[PDB]
Structure formats: structure tokens, C-alpha cells
Amino acid sequence: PIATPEVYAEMLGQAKQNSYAFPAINCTSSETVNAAIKGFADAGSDGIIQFSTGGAEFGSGLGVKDMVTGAVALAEFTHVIAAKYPVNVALHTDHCPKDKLDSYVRPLLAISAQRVSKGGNPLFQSHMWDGSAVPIDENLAIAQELLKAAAAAKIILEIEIGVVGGLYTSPEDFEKTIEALGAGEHGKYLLAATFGNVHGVYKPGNVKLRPDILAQGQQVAAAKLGLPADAKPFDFVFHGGSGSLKSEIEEALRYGVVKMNVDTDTQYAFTRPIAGHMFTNYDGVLKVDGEVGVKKVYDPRSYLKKAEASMSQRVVQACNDLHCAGKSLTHHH
Amino acid sequence: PIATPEVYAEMLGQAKQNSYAFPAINCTSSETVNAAIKGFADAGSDGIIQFSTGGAEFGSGLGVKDMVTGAVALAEFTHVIAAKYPVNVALHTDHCPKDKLDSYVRPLLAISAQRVSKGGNPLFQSHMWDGSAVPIDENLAIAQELLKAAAAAKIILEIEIGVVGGLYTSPEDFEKTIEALGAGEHGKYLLAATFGNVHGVYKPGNVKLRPDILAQGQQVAAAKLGLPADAKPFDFVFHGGSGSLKSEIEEALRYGVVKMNVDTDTQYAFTRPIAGHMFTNYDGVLKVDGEVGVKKVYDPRSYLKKAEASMSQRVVQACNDLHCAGKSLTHHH
Amino acid sequence: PIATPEVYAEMLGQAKQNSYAFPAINCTSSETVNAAIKGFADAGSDGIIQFSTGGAEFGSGLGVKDMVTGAVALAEFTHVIAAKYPVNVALHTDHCPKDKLDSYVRPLLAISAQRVSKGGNPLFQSHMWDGSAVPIDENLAIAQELLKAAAAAKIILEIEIGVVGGLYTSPEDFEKTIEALGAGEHGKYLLAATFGNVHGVYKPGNVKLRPDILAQGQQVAAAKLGLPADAKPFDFVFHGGSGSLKSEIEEALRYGVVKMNVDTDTQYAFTRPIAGHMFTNYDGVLKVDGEVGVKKVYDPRSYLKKAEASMSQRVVQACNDLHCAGKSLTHHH
Amino acid sequence: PIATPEVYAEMLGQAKQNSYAFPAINCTSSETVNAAIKGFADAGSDGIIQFSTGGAEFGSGLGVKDMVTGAVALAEFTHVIAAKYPVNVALHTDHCPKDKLDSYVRPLLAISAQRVSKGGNPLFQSHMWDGSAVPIDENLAIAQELLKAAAAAKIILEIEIGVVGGLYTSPEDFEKTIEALGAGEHGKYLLAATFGNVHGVYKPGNVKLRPDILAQGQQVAAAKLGLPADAKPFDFVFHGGSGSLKSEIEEALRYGVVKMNVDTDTQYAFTRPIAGHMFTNYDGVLKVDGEVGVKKVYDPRSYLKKAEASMSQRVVQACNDLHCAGKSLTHHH
Ligand code: NA
Ligand code: NA
Ligand code: NA
Ligand code: NA
Ligand SMILES: [Zn+2]
Ligand SMILES: [Zn+2]
Ligand SMILES: [Zn+2]
Ligand SMILES: [Zn+2]
Ligand SMILES: [Zn+2]
Ligand SMILES: [Zn+2]
Ligand SMILES: [Zn+2]
Ligand SMILES: [Zn+2]
């Protein structure tokens, strides 16, 4: 099913308590949503499907190019599909900067607020406010008001301090975050504290992650809140998960990462069999030498099924890397 | 917008009165729905989006493989998208044989009946009962009861007499159809009377259409109903529209075809630029010689945008071939 | 075997007498020479292999880029190969303009003159002087001296009046040609009289051949020589044979074409299976996703055999189009 | 130039004295010969071009399939080309087993014997007798008689003890070899003593070379001949050079390898740009959607130039790996 707000909060609480995380898979279409959910199910895992501003625009079609329309249309599709799977699927929106709040996150929040006010559940279960490009005090001022609105609509807010490339979060930024927002008692929030994360996939030695930054952030927060030195007040989000080393993922989990974003690696997994299909069927997908091609290989389903299955396999890998495989809160073993 | 039942009936009535038709485009995904609607809009045309049993299964994902789920999920997606376009978009389900009625058309009819009963409109605006594989009397017995159910849910029923290859309808089949169902006064129905139609795309000289069969059917019905010899009591559906000659389409329109199904040709249009993208970007969509590929070309949006635009262009062509271009009932000129 | 000068003159005389012609296939390599000769043999035909200035440069390798070296090296290769086939194979050099005579045709003539002077046969059996870019009187002045040199080395000279595109020869050019060179009694020559010929392959309606120009040339020559009106004093060469219509080839044969040059069409035939091989074996000819490819498909012989066989088939087609198939002067039936 | 017998013996003597080796590149065509020689020249190196039984068959064309014809034709081509380069190029024939001696090595030896007897030099400068599949005494009986014949024709004989995969030579095989053949004073020979060599290219950890076997062989021979313990009486040949580690090549050189065979790696280098050309020019090398392709990209020279240049680069790499780069005996610096 779609995760209810209660189930999603329980998911994140269980992940945090047990030092595992969920994949948050960027999707752009019916096929990619289907691939992501089948991946979670095949892994016996709960999971998160997320739409970026660009993914939502793409989802709305070239004739519309509207983020809200694409996100709503894909979310409505996902609600129907997720009802047919035993695992819990949460819907999220990815990076929304200041100049897009009025045309993405705010209108979507309003849609969920009206669903709530009629006794229903929100359309999305979390939204990202990415204020990393503005000064920390402005970022957290916007965050504080968005958190109030999100919590009232039964929605978790993700925020970002530090910039994701494709830098490293400061100790005072961690302190300000706890001061402005508390530690969940004013509404749950997820913190994308950057620690050398880069969007994309590069050769080894390029990306230089420093997970100790997350460890330091937990200690700074714990001290601020008068908690024991081993407390983990933040629920962290790991951006740019694709291409990461196993050892890097493990250390991040130990310091309270509960959500790792995946996009590039699932993109490659989706496209790879499509590429192979076109080459081995070159004289079927092209009308060559006066021939009329071969419908059974230019039928989009023929290669998109393969794309879907391949992307699902990569999502299974993500669930095993993040140690959420076999841990769905529905307990279908 | 999505066509209301009233708008759809007006669409079909206007097409019939003016000897034009609408394309009915088989879709399987968010991208193909988007491509079809943008095609209608670019042509200033109303149009029909249809889901086959296989398309619906595909739409539901490999983890579900359920026709109702796929059709509902894609229909809900389409409702959100179509609201953002000035033209009217009707939703239809394609060939449903006897052994699939209980798992496709009937449950979908029930969903729409419950929407109606609450003061709303049906989810789909037409459904196809394909009884061509059973004897004519059984076909029309099922048709009569389905027509009553469809009409009560504000839905138009498409039926088929004769088999689509990939044969030719008999005069007594036309007579029985009018006798069993009337001429619209017991609920509007569309008649796929086959006249040599074949699903697929072949070289010229293979497919042998006989449009005079449709002309004969109108005359047989007109005589049965005591109407003038030039009356056209049937609203015909032209299956297997892809690969057809212009001259063949024109003659069919003259005899009362109001809906022409397109699938194969839009499949080729969708896939063609994807094939081209994979070849010209071979070293970006594949990780070759120890390199890591190029994310900006293995991002599914990069080639799927091209696929969408190409399929839209083919849909524009269909609207101009069928003479519905520039005739949308919203009159946005 | 390689055609002796006596056999080559007999070949051309027989073709002329019987209104057929030989293909002259442009070759650039051991593989293409092999493909051309196997084509002649499979057709039971004699034939001509020709090297252009660019083909000879290519044959000499990127480290040399010398026309004489490439032509000699490929000719020596061809002498060994042709000895193993029952049919007669003549060697020719293609278009040599004024500024390349000193670095192509003249040095090659000198090589053959020294072979002759020792009691052997020439290395090449014909050479082309292409003087079409200079005024007719200069063209024929050079032709007259080259003809004397060629004949003394047992070599036939091909000349060109009119330009091949990628225009139409004048009546006075035909008259001057007979006046300057005679009709074979001062040494045999072949005349590339252009009649709308274009190098390359285009869609129909582009290239506009006028074979009546050749008919007029024969009549002009016949009148000059005091011969009957149906005499054919010229042995014509048809440049740009690829892409030509059957009807066009037939008319040209009737007017005395004895040699038709083929290049573009044999190029496509050679490359086509190589293209197919790369696509269907994409993951064998490329090291993909950390794999090491597949030696049995990146072995050049694997696709070059296919290229060779395909080009041979196109050469067989040329022999049947030109009506030299089954007519080799060795009579191996 | 082509290596004279005197120059080739000097080449091998210099390599041995200075612990370097020459690449022996398997070639099959005018293009691959051209690529190999340009590689040697670009490296300022002497080198060896070799034809296998299969390469020679391929060189003779599908219409002939005769090893002697292909080897002679390619050798004659190579004689013309090599005269235009400052470096010395030796011609060799690769593995010839017992049942092919009468149809490859023996007839080629006879051709060279007749050239010698007229005061010329041999066509090939070395021939391989591969008797590894027969018992050692039979192998060396055949070797002894072939060595006498080869030496009399100014040709060096390569022999093989041990089998190349795609095993390890025994101490008594080394002893028998010196006893039967001496150490050069009855004619120079090259010894392919196998030490775990495999033809082909595999992932690391598969091929398990044991160069100490060569070291042991030199010591066994030195003791037999009453030479100092550090003497190297054998000139070794390293089969299956492609895919080898640098460290492995270095150790083999120290123990007296003077010739390393390369085939698989130059095959990949040749094919790789052809593959790339076909993909990026897919709509030029194929006639697609009613178009006629693009002659400038289906011209075989367009991709074969790229193939030639790429293979030359790999040959340069081989000269630097084997430490013969910059050491050509013509001293063109
Ligand atoms: Na990344
Ligand atoms: Na069709
Ligand atoms: Na042409
Ligand atoms: Na190897
Ligand atoms: Zn991110
Ligand atoms: Zn459990
Ligand atoms: Zn149909
Ligand atoms: Zn209007
Ligand atoms: Zn020409
Ligand atoms: Zn005969
Ligand atoms: Zn070997
Ligand atoms: Zn030097």
C-alpha cells in the first residue's frame, strides 16, 4: 500500500533505531514507478519514490511542462499501483529551491492540506525544501514555517544544509538547525546534511565523502539537547547515493542516515537493456533496405519490460546495501 | 479536458454528420498518453486514448500484471493530464473477448457505475466488447446486456462483428445488429464491422480492404429501419488503421467510420528516435573500455522526450488524415 | 588469370561485337580485390579491377600515401590471386587528371614499358587519362602522346571528353577525337564520353542520362571515317554506373558501351554486413560493463568475410546487368 | 625495407644481446599489413609481420581458400610497401602442424629456395614448424630436416616444444632440442618453449605464466653446451602475447625472449573504431526509412583508415612494451 503518515513515521523510526535506511528512487514515469515498487517488493522492503522538479515536468508531458501537474498525475498513478503490493511505498518530492516553492512544494502542500481537512491522508508523505543556496538563517526561517504547514498536513519535511555537488556542513549550521526546529517534537523532519556528496556517477577517487561530519553533527545536537554523547537526534538523508562504496554507505548508516537517494544508477539500469535491444534488433527497430521493420521489437513494451526488470534489480541491490531488505513493516516473509 | 459523456456523444455525432473520424491511439504508459494528447492538441483536435488488455497489463507493472489495475492507474494519470489541455480527450478500452469480460470490462463498468451513482462521470467513456470469436447471436446477446449496463453508466459500447486479422462482415450480421440493438435509441454503440482490416503494418498489396462492405451495411440497416437509401444508421470503427492508404481512409469515412484505431504506426514513431539515440550515443549509454558512460544520455528523459515528440507528430498526421484536425469542439483556434 | 594484352583486346572486341560490357570495379584492398574477382568467377565472366588515385593512396597505407606504391602493391597482390581463377581479370587505373600524370600514370607506364622491353607483359592492361578539365585540343594532344606510349607497352588508353558530375559531350569533340586518334589503328583506346553521368547514388529523377549522345557520337565518327551509318567506331566507357536503371544500361550497351564503372554500389554491398555485424555483436566488438569482448566477433575476418561475399554478390549482379555473365573467354561452363 | 636474411639475423642477435624483443604481428590483409608496418615505423622499430594458416587462407579470398596463394599474395604486397619505410620488416609464417607442412611451409620453402638459387633472397625470412602435438623425438626429427632446408634458403626456423592453450615445457625437451639442433651453428632457430601461454585475451587470474621455465631451459642448455651458468643459448618466442602483464613481459625478456606474438590485441584495436563508426553513422551506413544512406561514410576507406591508425597505435605500444622502440637497425632518429 501507499505508506500512511503513521506507517511512514514508523518506517523512519525503525530504520533509525536499527541503523538501516530506505532507498529513495527518483522516478519519472509509469514504467520507472513500476520498476521501483517491484524492486521494493522483490526485496521484501518498504521504500520511497521521489519526483524531482525536472522529473515532474517530464511527467506532465512536453505539452504541459508543469511541475504540480506531473507530480500529481504520477502520484495518482502510484496510489493505484501501490495498493496491489504488500510493502509500504512513501511518496516524496526532491530538491525544491526558493524560487520554485510557489510552483511546486506550496501548491502540493495545499492539495494535501485539503485532503486532510476532509479526513483523508496527504497525497505525498514528505516534501523537500532545499534552501542550501541561501544563508542558513533564511533557510531555517523558511524551514520553520514549512515544517508547521507540513506537520499539520501529516507530512514530513526534508531540508538541506550544505550544497550537493554535481561541500561539507558546518558545526554552527547543525546547532542552528536544532535550535530552530527542535528534534521532532514540533514535527518530524529529515536533514540532508552534506558531507562531500555529489549527484552523478564518477570513477573512484573523485568523490570524497566525509561521514565523520554526520557523526559530529549528532554529537553537536546531543550536547545542545543535553542528551548522552551517543544520541542521534537527526534523521539524515544521503544525497547522491549512486556510485558510492559499500564501506561509505555502512559508515553513513551508523551515524543516522535513514534515507539514501538513488537516481543515476537506476537510470543506467533502466537504459542499459534498451540500448542492447536496439543494437541486437537494429533491422527490426529500423526500416532498412526497403523493409518495414518488425513490430514485435519496435513495440515499446518489448524493450520497456526489460528496462523495468533491470531497474527493479538495481533497486533490490539498493535495499540490500542499505539493510532494509527483508524488513518491510507488513512482515510478508 | 477529459470528454464528458455528453461531449463524447457530441464529438461522435459531429464526426458522423460531417464525414470525419477521430484517431483512437493505443497507449501503454505516461509517456505514450502524453504523446497522444499533445498530438491531438497540436492538431487542434479532439481524440481518443485506448488501452488494450496487454497495454493495461503492461501499465500495471511486471509485479502486478492485472488489467483492471493498469487501466485504472493509467486512466487516473490521464484525467490529471487532460485537464491541462484545451481539447477533449475520451478514454476507451480496446478488444475484450468473452473470457476476459469478468476481469476487464465488467469490473471497469462497475467502477464507473458507482461514480455515476454518486453524481459523477464514468472513468472511461467507452468500452469494447469483442465477441467476434463467438457466434453472432451469442455476440449480440452479450452486447445487448452490456449496452444496457454501459448506457446506464453514461458509457458508449463498441462491438465487433467479423474478425480483424493479424475477414468480411456478412449482410445478415448487419441486420441482426440493428434488430438486437436498434440505432442508438437504446444507448449509443460503435460498430467495428470488419472489411479486410488487419492489425499490423505490411507492404502494399498484402492487406485487401473492401470498404463497399460498410456501404452495404448502411444500406441494409437503412432498409431495415425504413430510412432513405443514403442514411447511415451505424457509427463504424476502423481497426488496424496503421499502414492504410489515404484513398482507403477516405472511402471508409464516406461510409460512416467515426473512429480509426492506430497502434503500430505510433509504436514505430515512438521507438524510432530511441533507436537513433542509442546508436549515436553508443559510448554514452554503454560503459565501454573501462569508462563510466554519460549520464546526460542514459537519463531516460533524454531519449523518451524524443520518443514522445515523434509519436505526437504521427498523431497529428492521423488527425489530418481523418479530417478531425482543427475541429475540436472547444473551438480554440 | 590476369588478362594478357591480347586477351584484353579480344575481350573488348567481343563485348563490342555482341553489344555487352564488362564491369570495372573500383577496389582499394586485398579484400575488395578478392570480392571483385570471386564475383566475376561466380558469374562465369571476365572483368576489370580498377584503382583510383584515392584508392591507390589508401592501398599504400597512411604511412606512405603514394599512388604509385599503392597501385603497384595492389597490382602485385592481384597477379597472384587472379592466377587461381579460370576467368580473365584486367587491371586498370581510374581518373588521372593533368597534375597527377607525373605521379601516377606516367610512372606506371614506365614500369610496364620496362617489363615489355624484357619480353614480359605490362603490369596494368589499361590506364585512364582524364583530361576533361582542360580544353579539348589540349586533352587530345596529351592523349595522342599517351596513346603512343601506352600502345608500345601493350596497354589500352581510356580518355574522357565531357565531365562526370558528383555534363554532355559535344559533336565537335567526337569529331576531334577521331581526327586526333583514329579508330584503333594507332592503338586501341576507350572513350568515356559523358552523357549525364554522375559519380554516386541518388534517388530516381535526379540523374538525367541522355544515351542518344553516344548514338550521335557513333554516327558522327562513322560519317568522318566514311563508314555505314550503323557503324560503331568508338568503344565507350559508362562512368558512374551505380544506381542506374536497367533500361538506361540497355540503351548504353546498344550504342557501344563496353566498360561500365562500378564503385558506390559495391561500397554499400561491402559495408552493409559489417554494419549489421557490429550491431548484432555490439557486446562482443565492444568491451562493455567490465567485460573483455568476444574475440571470435572482433576478429576482422569474421565481418570481412561477410563484406567480401556481399560485394561479390553485387559484382555478379553487375555481370548479369551488363550481359557479360556466362561469356568469359576461357569457356569454363 | 624488407629485412634481408643478414639484417634479420642481426636484428635477433641485437635483441638477444640487449634483452629486448620484437613484436610479431598477425596480419590478414593489405590494411592490417599497412597498420603493422606504420606501427613499427612510428615506434622507430624493426618488426615482424606473420601470417597464420587461417590468415593466409583468408588472404587468398573465399574463391580460392589456399594457404600458399594467400601467403604469397600478401608477401608480394608487403615487399612493395616495406620498401617505402626506413625500418626493417621481416616476414614470417605462424603455426604449421604436421598435416599442413605439405600445403604451407614446404611449398613456401621451395619458392624461396628457387629465389636463392638465382641469387636472390627468400620471400619469407622465417617459417614456423609447430610440432607440439607430436612426440618430442618426432617433432625434432622433422625440425632437424626443416632446419637444414631453411638455412640453405637463408631462412630462420621457429619450432615449438609444449602446447599453447586457447602447458609447460619439460627439462628433457630442452636437452633434446640442443642435442638435435645445436645452438645456431647448424642454422639459426627460434624456440617457442611454452610456459603457460594461451592464445586470446582473458580477465586477470586466468592465464598463469611461469617464466622461470625459460630460465631453467637456458640453464639446462648452458650446462649441456659446457657454457657459463648465465649463458642464454636459446632465442625464445613468447606466444599469446596479448593481454599479458608488463611484469610478465619483463621477466620473459630477461630469459631470452626475442619475439613476442601479438594478434588478439591488434584485432581489437583494428575493429574498435569500425564498431564506433557504424553506430555513430548508423543512418549513413544503412539505407533507412526510404533514404539512400551516405556514401562518404559507407565508403570502406572511411572506417578502414580509422581501423588502420588504431591498430598502428597498438603496435607502437607493443614496441615500447618489448623495448625495441627507437632501436631500428637503420638508425633513423
Ligand atoms: Na553519486
Ligand atoms: Na494495419
Ligand atoms: Na552513379
Ligand atoms: Na594471450
Ligand atoms: Zn539530491
Ligand atoms: Zn518480520
Ligand atoms: Zn483492433
Ligand atoms: Zn471552431
Ligand atoms: Zn568515373
Ligand atoms: Zn563458351
Ligand atoms: Zn601462437
Ligand atoms: Zn641509433
PDB file of N, CA, C and O in Angstrom, chain B residues 19-23 25 38-46 245-247 249-250 253 260 262 312-327:
ATOM      1  N   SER B  19     -18.738  13.552 -41.898  1.00  0.00           N
ATOM      2  CA  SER B  19     -17.897  12.540 -42.555  1.00  0.00           C
ATOM      3  C   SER B  19     -16.410  12.650 -42.205  1.00  0.00           C
ATOM      4  O   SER B  19     -15.545  12.532 -43.082  1.00  0.00           O
ATOM      5  N   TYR B  20     -16.116  12.882 -40.924  1.00  0.00           N
ATOM      6  CA  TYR B  20     -14.744  12.753 -40.430  1.00  0.00           C
ATOM      7  C   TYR B  20     -14.696  11.759 -39.280  1.00  0.00           C
ATOM      8  O   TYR B  20     -15.734  11.231 -38.875  1.00  0.00           O
ATOM      9  N   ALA B  21     -13.493  11.478 -38.783  1.00  0.00           N
ATOM     10  CA  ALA B  21     -13.314  10.494 -37.713  1.00  0.00           C
ATOM     11  C   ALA B  21     -12.244  10.955 -36.750  1.00  0.00           C
ATOM     12  O   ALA B  21     -11.477  11.855 -37.073  1.00  0.00           O
ATOM     13  N   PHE B  22     -12.182  10.306 -35.587  1.00  0.00           N
ATOM     14  CA  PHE B  22     -11.134  10.569 -34.599  1.00  0.00           C
ATOM     15  C   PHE B  22     -10.153   9.423 -34.556  1.00  0.00           C
ATOM     16  O   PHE B  22     -10.552   8.261 -34.712  1.00  0.00           O
ATOM     17  N   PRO B  23      -8.875   9.739 -34.322  1.00  0.00           N
ATOM     18  CA  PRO B  23      -7.935   8.671 -34.056  1.00  0.00           C
ATOM     19  C   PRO B  23      -8.192   8.126 -32.662  1.00  0.00           C
ATOM     20  O   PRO B  23      -8.543   8.879 -31.742  1.00  0.00           O
ATOM     21  N   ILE B  25      -5.853   6.175 -30.205  1.00  0.00           N
ATOM     22  CA  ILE B  25      -4.430   5.813 -30.117  1.00  0.00           C
ATOM     23  C   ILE B  25      -4.189   4.848 -28.972  1.00  0.00           C
ATOM     24  O   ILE B  25      -4.495   5.169 -27.821  1.00  0.00           O
ATOM     25  N   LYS B  38      -0.770  15.454 -26.600  1.00  0.00           N
ATOM     26  CA  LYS B  38      -0.063  16.580 -27.239  1.00  0.00           C
ATOM     27  C   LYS B  38      -0.301  16.565 -28.759  1.00  0.00           C
ATOM     28  O   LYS B  38      -0.437  17.619 -29.371  1.00  0.00           O
ATOM     29  N   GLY B  39      -0.388  15.365 -29.342  1.00  0.00           N
ATOM     30  CA  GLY B  39      -0.718  15.238 -30.768  1.00  0.00           C
ATOM     31  C   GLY B  39      -2.097  15.815 -31.081  1.00  0.00           C
ATOM     32  O   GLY B  39      -2.252  16.607 -32.023  1.00  0.00           O
ATOM     33  N   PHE B  40      -3.102  15.423 -30.300  1.00  0.00           N
ATOM     34  CA  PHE B  40      -4.439  15.979 -30.501  1.00  0.00           C
ATOM     35  C   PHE B  40      -4.398  17.501 -30.385  1.00  0.00           C
ATOM     36  O   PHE B  40      -4.950  18.234 -31.223  1.00  0.00           O
ATOM     37  N   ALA B  41      -3.742  17.996 -29.339  1.00  0.00           N
ATOM     38  CA  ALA B  41      -3.717  19.436 -29.087  1.00  0.00           C
ATOM     39  C   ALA B  41      -3.006  20.177 -30.208  1.00  0.00           C
ATOM     40  O   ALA B  41      -3.472  21.223 -30.673  1.00  0.00           O
ATOM     41  N   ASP B  42      -1.883  19.624 -30.671  1.00  0.00           N
ATOM     42  CA  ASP B  42      -1.128  20.269 -31.751  1.00  0.00           C
ATOM     43  C   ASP B  42      -1.934  20.310 -33.048  1.00  0.00           C
ATOM     44  O   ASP B  42      -1.755  21.211 -33.876  1.00  0.00           O
ATOM     45  N   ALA B  43      -2.825  19.334 -33.208  1.00  0.00           N
ATOM     46  CA  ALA B  43      -3.715  19.284 -34.374  1.00  0.00           C
ATOM     47  C   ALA B  43      -5.002  20.078 -34.184  1.00  0.00           C
ATOM     48  O   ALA B  43      -5.846  20.088 -35.076  1.00  0.00           O
ATOM     49  N   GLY B  44      -5.186  20.705 -33.023  1.00  0.00           N
ATOM     50  CA  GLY B  44      -6.457  21.381 -32.710  1.00  0.00           C
ATOM     51  C   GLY B  44      -7.637  20.420 -32.784  1.00  0.00           C
ATOM     52  O   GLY B  44      -8.735  20.788 -33.237  1.00  0.00           O
ATOM     53  N   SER B  45      -7.420  19.197 -32.306  1.00  0.00           N
ATOM     54  CA  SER B  45      -8.379  18.105 -32.470  1.00  0.00           C
ATOM     55  C   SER B  45      -8.777  17.477 -31.140  1.00  0.00           C
ATOM     56  O   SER B  45      -7.967  17.405 -30.213  1.00  0.00           O
ATOM     57  N   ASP B  46     -10.010  16.987 -31.062  1.00  0.00           N
ATOM     58  CA  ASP B  46     -10.375  16.053 -30.003  1.00  0.00           C
ATOM     59  C   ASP B  46      -9.823  14.670 -30.374  1.00  0.00           C
ATOM     60  O   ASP B  46      -9.394  14.438 -31.511  1.00  0.00           O
ATOM     61  N   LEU B 245      -3.777   3.133 -46.871  1.00  0.00           N
ATOM     62  CA  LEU B 245      -3.688   4.148 -47.911  1.00  0.00           C
ATOM     63  C   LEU B 245      -4.657   5.285 -47.616  1.00  0.00           C
ATOM     64  O   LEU B 245      -5.691   5.071 -46.974  1.00  0.00           O
ATOM     65  N   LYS B 246      -4.301   6.483 -48.082  1.00  0.00           N
ATOM     66  CA  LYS B 246      -5.146   7.672 -47.990  1.00  0.00           C
ATOM     67  C   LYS B 246      -6.510   7.418 -48.632  1.00  0.00           C
ATOM     68  O   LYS B 246      -7.550   7.666 -48.023  1.00  0.00           O
ATOM     69  N   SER B 247      -6.492   6.911 -49.859  1.00  0.00           N
ATOM     70  CA  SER B 247      -7.716   6.609 -50.599  1.00  0.00           C
ATOM     71  C   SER B 247      -8.650   5.657 -49.846  1.00  0.00           C
ATOM     72  O   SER B 247      -9.875   5.786 -49.931  1.00  0.00           O
ATOM     73  N   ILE B 249      -8.734   5.285 -46.453  1.00  0.00           N
ATOM     74  CA  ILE B 249      -9.267   6.046 -45.324  1.00  0.00           C
ATOM     75  C   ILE B 249     -10.434   6.929 -45.792  1.00  0.00           C
ATOM     76  O   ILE B 249     -11.494   6.939 -45.168  1.00  0.00           O
ATOM     77  N   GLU B 250     -10.255   7.628 -46.911  1.00  0.00           N
ATOM     78  CA  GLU B 250     -11.314   8.498 -47.448  1.00  0.00           C
ATOM     79  C   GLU B 250     -12.634   7.784 -47.726  1.00  0.00           C
ATOM     80  O   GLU B 250     -13.704   8.298 -47.398  1.00  0.00           O
ATOM     81  N   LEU B 253     -14.393   6.801 -44.468  1.00  0.00           N
ATOM     82  CA  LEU B 253     -15.037   7.986 -43.878  1.00  0.00           C
ATOM     83  C   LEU B 253     -16.381   8.273 -44.519  1.00  0.00           C
ATOM     84  O   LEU B 253     -17.352   8.588 -43.824  1.00  0.00           O
ATOM     85  N   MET B 260     -10.935   5.613 -35.967  1.00  0.00           N
ATOM     86  CA  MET B 260      -9.935   4.739 -36.569  1.00  0.00           C
ATOM     87  C   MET B 260      -8.837   4.478 -35.562  1.00  0.00           C
ATOM     88  O   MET B 260      -8.236   5.423 -35.034  1.00  0.00           O
ATOM     89  N   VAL B 262      -5.321   3.398 -34.126  1.00  0.00           N
ATOM     90  CA  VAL B 262      -3.913   3.462 -34.516  1.00  0.00           C
ATOM     91  C   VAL B 262      -3.054   2.894 -33.388  1.00  0.00           C
ATOM     92  O   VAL B 262      -3.225   3.244 -32.216  1.00  0.00           O
ATOM     93  N   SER B 312       3.892  12.154 -31.068  1.00  0.00           N
ATOM     94  CA  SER B 312       2.919  13.254 -31.204  1.00  0.00           C
ATOM     95  C   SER B 312       2.774  13.663 -32.670  1.00  0.00           C
ATOM     96  O   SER B 312       1.649  13.888 -33.147  1.00  0.00           O
ATOM     97  N   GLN B 313       3.898  13.753 -33.382  1.00  0.00           N
ATOM     98  CA  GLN B 313       3.874  14.131 -34.805  1.00  0.00           C
ATOM     99  C   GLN B 313       3.046  13.132 -35.619  1.00  0.00           C
ATOM    100  O   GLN B 313       2.275  13.527 -36.506  1.00  0.00           O
ATOM    101  N   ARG B 314       3.178  11.844 -35.303  1.00  0.00           N
ATOM    102  CA  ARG B 314       2.408  10.826 -36.027  1.00  0.00           C
ATOM    103  C   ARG B 314       0.916  10.931 -35.704  1.00  0.00           C
ATOM    104  O   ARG B 314       0.064  10.653 -36.564  1.00  0.00           O
ATOM    105  N   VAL B 315       0.608  11.315 -34.468  1.00  0.00           N
ATOM    106  CA  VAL B 315      -0.786  11.548 -34.078  1.00  0.00           C
ATOM    107  C   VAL B 315      -1.354  12.770 -34.818  1.00  0.00           C
ATOM    108  O   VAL B 315      -2.491  12.721 -35.309  1.00  0.00           O
ATOM    109  N   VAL B 316      -0.571  13.842 -34.950  1.00  0.00           N
ATOM    110  CA  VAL B 316      -1.004  14.977 -35.782  1.00  0.00           C
ATOM    111  C   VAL B 316      -1.343  14.500 -37.202  1.00  0.00           C
ATOM    112  O   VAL B 316      -2.392  14.866 -37.761  1.00  0.00           O
ATOM    113  N   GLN B 317      -0.472  13.671 -37.777  1.00  0.00           N
ATOM    114  CA  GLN B 317      -0.726  13.131 -39.113  1.00  0.00           C
ATOM    115  C   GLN B 317      -2.069  12.392 -39.169  1.00  0.00           C
ATOM    116  O   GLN B 317      -2.840  12.573 -40.115  1.00  0.00           O
ATOM    117  N   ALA B 318      -2.339  11.566 -38.155  1.00  0.00           N
ATOM    118  CA  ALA B 318      -3.615  10.846 -38.076  1.00  0.00           C
ATOM    119  C   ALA B 318      -4.818  11.785 -38.055  1.00  0.00           C
ATOM    120  O   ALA B 318      -5.806  11.523 -38.743  1.00  0.00           O
ATOM    121  N   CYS B 319      -4.734  12.874 -37.280  1.00  0.00           N
ATOM    122  CA  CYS B 319      -5.816  13.875 -37.247  1.00  0.00           C
ATOM    123  C   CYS B 319      -6.035  14.546 -38.602  1.00  0.00           C
ATOM    124  O   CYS B 319      -7.173  14.844 -38.974  1.00  0.00           O
ATOM    125  N   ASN B 320      -4.968  14.770 -39.357  1.00  0.00           N
ATOM    126  CA  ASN B 320      -5.135  15.351 -40.689  1.00  0.00           C
ATOM    127  C   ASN B 320      -5.624  14.339 -41.721  1.00  0.00           C
ATOM    128  O   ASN B 320      -6.369  14.692 -42.634  1.00  0.00           O
ATOM    129  N   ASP B 321      -5.213  13.084 -41.563  1.00  0.00           N
ATOM    130  CA  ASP B 321      -5.720  12.001 -42.435  1.00  0.00           C
ATOM    131  C   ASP B 321      -7.208  11.726 -42.238  1.00  0.00           C
ATOM    132  O   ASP B 321      -7.908  11.349 -43.179  1.00  0.00           O
ATOM    133  N   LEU B 322      -7.668  11.888 -41.002  1.00  0.00           N
ATOM    134  CA  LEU B 322      -9.055  11.583 -40.645  1.00  0.00           C
ATOM    135  C   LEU B 322      -9.958  12.811 -40.668  1.00  0.00           C
ATOM    136  O   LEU B 322     -11.167  12.703 -40.439  1.00  0.00           O
ATOM    137  N   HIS B 323      -9.361  13.972 -40.937  1.00  0.00           N
ATOM    138  CA  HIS B 323     -10.092  15.236 -41.109  1.00  0.00           C
ATOM    139  C   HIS B 323     -10.773  15.753 -39.846  1.00  0.00           C
ATOM    140  O   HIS B 323     -11.749  16.503 -39.915  1.00  0.00           O
ATOM    141  N   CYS B 324     -10.225  15.372 -38.693  1.00  0.00           N
ATOM    142  CA  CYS B 324     -10.658  15.957 -37.421  1.00  0.00           C
ATOM    143  C   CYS B 324      -9.744  17.099 -36.945  1.00  0.00           C
ATOM    144  O   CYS B 324     -10.090  17.828 -36.007  1.00  0.00           O
ATOM    145  N   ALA B 325      -8.589  17.257 -37.585  1.00  0.00           N
ATOM    146  CA  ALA B 325      -7.701  18.374 -37.252  1.00  0.00           C
ATOM    147  C   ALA B 325      -8.438  19.697 -37.417  1.00  0.00           C
ATOM    148  O   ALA B 325      -9.161  19.900 -38.399  1.00  0.00           O
ATOM    149  N   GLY B 326      -8.249  20.593 -36.452  1.00  0.00           N
ATOM    150  CA  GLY B 326      -8.850  21.922 -36.489  1.00  0.00           C
ATOM    151  C   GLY B 326     -10.325  21.958 -36.137  1.00  0.00           C
ATOM    152  O   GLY B 326     -10.971  23.009 -36.284  1.00  0.00           O
ATOM    153  N   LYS B 327     -10.855  20.827 -35.664  1.00  0.00           N
ATOM    154  CA  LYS B 327     -12.300  20.712 -35.418  1.00  0.00           C
ATOM    155  C   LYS B 327     -12.691  20.401 -33.966  1.00  0.00           C
ATOM    156  O   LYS B 327     -13.854  20.093 -33.682  1.00  0.00           O
TER     157      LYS B 327
END
